[PDB]
């Protein structure tokens, strides 16, 4: 019973790139669909599938091929990446397409970042910040503050680990990244996220807090040629330790 | 054929907030309200196909066919309501035309205001001095900042489950010689009782 | 405006010879065809004209999708029919959805299923509920029934999206379907007196006999309406002669708010 | 099971005349299931180019066709229309009567 399942959750990649987005339900549906979801705009359809062995274009087809393979599977294919192309994708599946008060079961999507060149991909750079000792007098609690910054483009996932267990309670981490540089078009990114514990949990000195943030970047076939590291996907972290 | 919707709405904690949507299209098969959360799949939240009202929980919808519109009803409203909410009307040929979206925001209610602006601990792999705005009502509005070397992120709700407590913030950073956490929110309106502790 | 209906047909069989088509669907404003598609060709197409040239070509390639969906659907509803009555062979599964336009204003809006040629379910869209022939249509009910936006859904499309399509059609073809060519009458004998029309447009007429003045429905032997083949009309009436008493038969034809009495010498 | 037998009408376009163009039909209907054989007869042979609609589709759930073909009617030919059906042992002739 996993509903609507598809990969990838990101990839950025070059113009001219070739890329696959698979989709799988295991509902029994019949109808299959792939969207995509752009600011400031309703969603609009690439293509469907009615029913297995049928496909047709949607309202946007154009530099987009799919392959409905079988009943579960249905493949959106981009055989030359294009900048416009930068979008939220989502797959769909109802169960029938002519049913007509049948709803949508949505994929939890696809984010694709089409770039000239790779040149400009950075992943972030994490610290954290311990809290302060006149927030801990004046209010019995203690906020930590993880900041990732420089990051292009906004691939990241970012968590906290305390004790070696995520946590999610106390947490609030922001909910779009921060432009650095908000005129640039290709501005690198700055994101915080915010842990509060009591000031008796922070007291206790072998409490461990560690934030983290995945970041999807290139691959072994992704062409590297700066003098720089090579930004492949990577976790970047950083911790502390109670303070008594 | 298009679907209009209002871009954000903003309503505070336990309060009622109507979400309209209206539609002109070639036909009409029937309107759809989904859940979206930040990141996450649209969720299906409702079908209305004939006039009238319909409840499910703390939401209900409303549709007119005459008048081409629909609402969706929220009541007692909840942080977890923060999403978008988007409206999708099937045509004469069963074709979902899709509304751009509501943005629903939702100010906590904020019990005991203790406005501050703390200066976080160095750390020792950065050059970066890190100050934290917190505890402030939820009327307050946190402006971006106007030096290029200033970093300011808006305002974020945190909640303590364990202690059924929450919280707006908002943090702001540099590496400048002259910032400090006395001055990094000057550009924006903050609480005349702004606690401001004192630097060592 | 007179009386105008517009309708689509489905019929899908089991086991179906190998060249007859599995499934099947027509559209017909009141009497034309308007549309067909089968599970030979995969293509819905027009059959009327006045279809074909007010529709653009993304239209039948929308439908021609929605149909070859629907085909799939019919499939799996007559395998599920064909499993619970425990019938071995070839059977049928047909479905009928429409609305009428009433000279009047006032519209109508019908849908049903049929198995083997005989009622299987009816909606009734006043009550929201579907009206079952035996338990197997009873199951199918309940599950129907249990899904009640879909039954709000076709509530509104038999008084709302129906009504729309046909006010469209009937514009489209109104040269076609809102002309009136009256009937060319005569009577002979054959002993029973024969009163024949020919050449009529639409085919909707009233043809009887009185005897004296009076109508005796149960002595008349009323004819079908036929089509001509060239988009015009035929019926006829008999009544049989009284060999030991004369009296005055005459003919009465109505058709499109004209009275027409042939009286027998 | 019911099976319906089909309703075999044979009659001209027009009022016939001898020496004068016309159209012979045959109008089968009421009939279930829809499979049918239709022909045409002259004299007892069947026409080859005869034409028909397409399957229509009644009320009732029976079907209905109609087959046609261009003739002259004369003094000594004779027509019929000949049908099976599953619900026919042998093919039903029904002779065009005037
Ligand atoms: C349940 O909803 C409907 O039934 C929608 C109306 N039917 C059609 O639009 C239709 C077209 C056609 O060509 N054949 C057919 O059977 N139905």
């Known amino acids: 019973n996993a509903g609507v399942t598809q990969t990838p959750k990101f990839q950025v990649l070059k113009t001219g790139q070739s890329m696959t987005l698979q989709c799988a339900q295991d509902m029994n549906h019949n109808s299959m669909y792939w969207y995509r979801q752009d600011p400031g705009m309703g969603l609009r359809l690439i293509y469907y599938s009615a029913s297995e062995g049928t496909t047709d274009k949607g309202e946007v087809p154009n530099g987009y091929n799919v392959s409905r393979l079988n009943k579960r599977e249905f493949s959106l294919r981009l055989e030359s990446a294009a900048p416009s192309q930068t979008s939220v994708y989502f797959c769909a599946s109802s169960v029938w397409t002519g049913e007509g008060s049948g709803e949508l079961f949505f994929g939890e999507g696809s984010r694709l970042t089409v770039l000239e060149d790779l040149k400009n991909v950075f992943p972030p750079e994490v610290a954290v910040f311990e809290p302060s000792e006149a927030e801990i007098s004046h209010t019995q609690k203690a906020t930590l503050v993880c900041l990732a910054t420089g990051f292009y483009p906004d691939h990241v996932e970012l968590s906290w680990w305390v004790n070696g267990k995520e946590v999610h309670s106390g947490v609030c981490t922001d909910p779009q990244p921060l432009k650095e540089q908000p005129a640039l078009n290709d501005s690198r990114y700055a994101l915080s996220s915010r842990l509060r514990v009591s000031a008796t949990f922070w007291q206790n000195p072998r409490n461990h807090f560690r934030c983290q943030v995945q970041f999807y970047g290139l691959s072994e076939n992704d062409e590297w040629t700066q003098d720089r590291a090579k930004p492949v996907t990577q976790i970047v972290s950083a911790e502390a330790w109670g303070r008594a | ?200 | 405006m007179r009386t105008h209906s517009l309708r689509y047909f489905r019929l899908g069989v089991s086991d179906p010879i190998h060249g007859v088509p599995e499934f099947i669907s027509v559209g017909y404003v009141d009497s034309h065809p308007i549309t067909t598609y089968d599970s030979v060709t995969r293509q819905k197409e027009p059959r009327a004209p006045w279809m074909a040239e007010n529709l653009a070509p993304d239209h039948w390639e929308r439908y021609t999708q929605l149909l070859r969906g629907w085909q799939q659907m019919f499939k799996v509803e007559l395998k599920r029919l064909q499993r619970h009555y425990n019938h071995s062979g070839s059977h049928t599964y047909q479905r009928m959805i429409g609305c009428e336009l009433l000279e009047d204003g006032s519209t109508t809006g019908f849908l049903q299923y049929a198995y083997d040629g005989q009622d299987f379910l009816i909606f009734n869209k006043d009550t929201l509920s579907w009206l079952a022939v035996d338990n197997v249509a009873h199951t199918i009910k309940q599950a129907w029934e249990a899904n009640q936006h879909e039954l709000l859904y076709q509530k509104n499309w038999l008084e709302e999206e129906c009504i729309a399509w046909l006010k469209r059609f009937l514009e489209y073809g109104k040269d076609t379907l809102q002309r009136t060519e009256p009937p060319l009458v005569r009577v002979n004998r054959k002993t029973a007196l024969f009163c024949k029309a020919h050449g009529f447009y639409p085919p909707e007429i009233y043809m009887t006999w009185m005897k004296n003045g009076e109508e005796i429905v149960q002595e008349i032997d009323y004819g079908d309406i036929l089509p001509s083949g060239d988009g015009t009309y035929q019926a006829w009436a008999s009544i049989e002669l009284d060999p030991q008493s004369s009296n005055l038969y005459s003919c009465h034809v109505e058709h499109s708010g004209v009275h027409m009495v042939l009286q027998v010498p | 099971m019911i099976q319906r037998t089909p309703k075999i009408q044979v009659y001209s376009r027009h009022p016939a005349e001898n020496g004068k163009s016309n159209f012979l039909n045959c109008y089968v209907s009421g009939f279930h299931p829809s499979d049918i054989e239709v022909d045409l007869l002259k004299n007892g042979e069947r026409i080859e180019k005869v034409e028909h609609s397409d399957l229509s589709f009644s009320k009732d759930w029976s079907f209905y066709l109609l087959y046609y073909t261009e003739f002259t009617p004369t003094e000594k030919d004779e027509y019929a229309c000949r049908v099976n059906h599953v619900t026919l042992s042998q093919p039903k002739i029904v002779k065009w009567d005037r």
């Open chain 2, 1 to 200: 054929q298009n679907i209009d919707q209002p871009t954000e709405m903003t309503a505070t904690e336990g309060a009622i907030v109507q979400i309209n949507c209206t539609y002109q299209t070639s036909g009409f098969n029937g309107l759809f309200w989904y859940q979206q959360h930040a990141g996450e799949a649209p969720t299906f939240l409702s079908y209305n196909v004939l006039d009238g009202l319909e409840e499910k929980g703390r939401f209900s919808s409303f549709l007119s066919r005459s008048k081409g519109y629909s609402y969706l009803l929220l009541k007692e409203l909840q942080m977890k309501d923060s999403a978008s909410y988007l409206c999708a009307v099937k045509d004469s040929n069963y074709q979902l035309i899709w509304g751009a979206g509501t943005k629903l925001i939702i100010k906590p209610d904020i019990q005991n205001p203790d406005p501050a602006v703390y200066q976080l601990r160095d750390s020792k792999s950065s050059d970066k001095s890190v100050c934290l705005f917190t505890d402030f009502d939820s009327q307050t509005n946190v402006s971006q900042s106007k030096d290029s070397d200033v970093y300011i992120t808006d305002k974020c709700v945190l909640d303590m489950r364990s202690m059924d407590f929450k919280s707006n913030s908002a943090v702001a950073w540099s590496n400048k010689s002259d910032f400090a956490c006395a001055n990094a929110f000057n550009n924006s309106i903050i609480p005349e009782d702004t606690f401001f502790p004192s630097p060592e």
